[PDB]
Each structure stands twice: as C-alpha cells, then as structure tokens.
Amino acid sequence: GTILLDLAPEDKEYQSVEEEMQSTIREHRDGGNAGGIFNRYNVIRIQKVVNKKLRERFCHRQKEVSEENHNHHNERMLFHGSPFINAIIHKGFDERHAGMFGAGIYFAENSSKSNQYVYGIGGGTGCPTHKDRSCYICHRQMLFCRVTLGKSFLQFSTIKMAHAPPGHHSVIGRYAEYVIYRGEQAYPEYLITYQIMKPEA
Ligand SMILES: COc1cc(Cl)c(C#N)cc1C(=O)NCCN1CCC(C(=O)c2ccc(F)cc2)CC1
Ligand code: NA
C-alpha cells in the first residue's frame, strides 16, 4: 500500500519543493486557457509518497538504465499533472494509458505546464464542481517526480513514437517536454495539493 508522509511547512524539503513549483510558473501560449490565470500557487500541502513496490520497480529499472547509459541514471525531478494522480501514487505511472511525442508519459520542468494537464488534455472541462479551468476554489493535485531519463534522444518535431529510440531511454521533445516510455522510469516522489491564485487587481 501507498503511504503519504506529511511534510511540515518549516521543512527544508517542503520549502524546496514549493520553491521549485512557484518559480517555474510561466506564461503559456494559450494565454491561460488550459490551466487558468495566475502568478502564484497557494500550496495546501506537500506529501512524500512511499510505496515499496513502486520503489522496487523504480530501482530495478534505473539499474538497467545506468547499465546502458555509462553507469548514469541521469535522474531529474520534474512535474507531472493529470487527472490520474491518485491512481499514479498507488499503482505507479502506466504507459499503457498513453501525444506530441508518442505514447509516452509526460513531464514538465515548468509546474505551470503540468497544471495545464491536471484536469485533462487542454485542461479538459476544468474542475468537476465548476467546469472552470481557471477555478480558484477547487484543490488541484500535481506530482514532482524523480524521472530516470538515462540517455535522452532529442526530438525537434512532433513524432508519434511508441518507445525511445534504440539505445535511448527518454525523449526530450521540442520549450521541452520530457517523455519516457516506461512507467518504471518515474517515481511520484511528491504529491502537491494546491490551488492556483487569482492575481491581484
Ligand atoms: C501529452 O499529455 C501530457 C503532457 C504533459 Cl506536459 C503532462 C504533464 N505534466 C501530462 C500529460 C497527460 O496527462 N497526458 C494524458 C496521458 N497520460 C498517460 C499515462 C497516464 C498514467 O500514467 C496512468 C497510471 C495509472 C492509471 F490508472 C491511469 C493512468 C496519465 C495520463
Ligand atoms: Na502523461
């Protein structure tokens, strides 16, 4: 079973994660259409996900990856947001449920990019209660994950890939989207619960 460790706001970790989330908010080409309009998040809570099976699968996989990437995991903390966060923290990422760079699992360096996906592709129909993509009431969830990138393949054009190219373990596509093709190359380290904040007048 999954265990959620509740981080205290006075925790360096907590602060470190919130800092990464707040500082990577950016203006998106859609003018806020998908994720809403905001400049800052109100972080309700940050929790650490502990799940033995997921950890085991993740360790097993980075082992194979480093073994192919000159003994380097090439790990990176990245954000992921989607309507399946809950299934993810219990069963892990699943590429069978998978896109601009193929049937992979996507991660963003910008928290605001992930927020655009919290309610679905293009933000879907927004939050359940108000059908509002820029809802300032409803609590959103986002993950800040350890992603095993290994040897990244650089893709500069949309392509429907099924897996990373031979000898590769991830695809950095072009900002840049980080895409892996195996659920085990990502561990949902932090579960962030938050609200976007309405900018002041
Ligand atoms: C191209 O789509 C994206 C791009 C970005 Cl940049 C981000 C972010 N940040 C998230 C998505 C996304 O959620 N796509 C939908 C397809 N995903 C497939 C894998 C799914 C998954 O891992 C899962 C695991 C267990 C389940 F029970 C259900 C789904 C999540 C949904
Ligand atoms: Na995804």
Swiss-Prot record:
Ubiquitous; highest levels in testis. Residues 8-201 form the PARP catalytic domain. Zn(2+) binds at C127, H130, C135, C138. Changing E177A: Loss of activity. Phosphorylated on serine residues by MAPK kinases upon insulin stimulation. Phosphorylated during mitosis. Ubiquitinated by RNF146 when auto-poly-ADP-ribosylated, leading to its degradation. Deubiquitinated by USP25; leading to stabilization. It is found in: Cytoplasm; Golgi apparatus membrane; Cytoplasm, Cytoskeleton, Microtubule organizing center, Centrosome; Nucleus, Nuclear pore complex. Poly-ADP-ribosyltransferase involved in various processes such as Wnt signaling pathway, telomere length and vesicle trafficking. Acts as an activator of the Wnt signaling pathway by mediating poly-ADP-ribosylation (PARsylation) of AXIN1 and AXIN2, 2 key components of the beta-catenin destruction complex: poly-ADP-ribosylated target proteins are recognized by RNF146, which mediates their ubiquitination and subsequent degradation. Also mediates PARsylation of BLZF1 and CASC3, followed by recruitment of RNF146 and subsequent ubiquitination. Oligomerizes and associates with TNKS2. Interacts with the cytoplasmic domain of LNPEP/Otase in SLC2A4/GLUT4-vesicles. Binds to the N-terminus of telomeric TERF1 via the ANK repeats. Found in a complex with POT1; TERF1 and TINF2. Interacts with AXIN1. Interacts with AXIN2. Interacts with BLZF1 and CASC3. Interacts with NUMA1. Belongs to the ARTD/PARP family. This is Poly [ADP-ribose] polymerase tankyrase-1. It comes from Homo sapiens. The chain holds residues 1105 to 1315 of 1327 of the full protein.
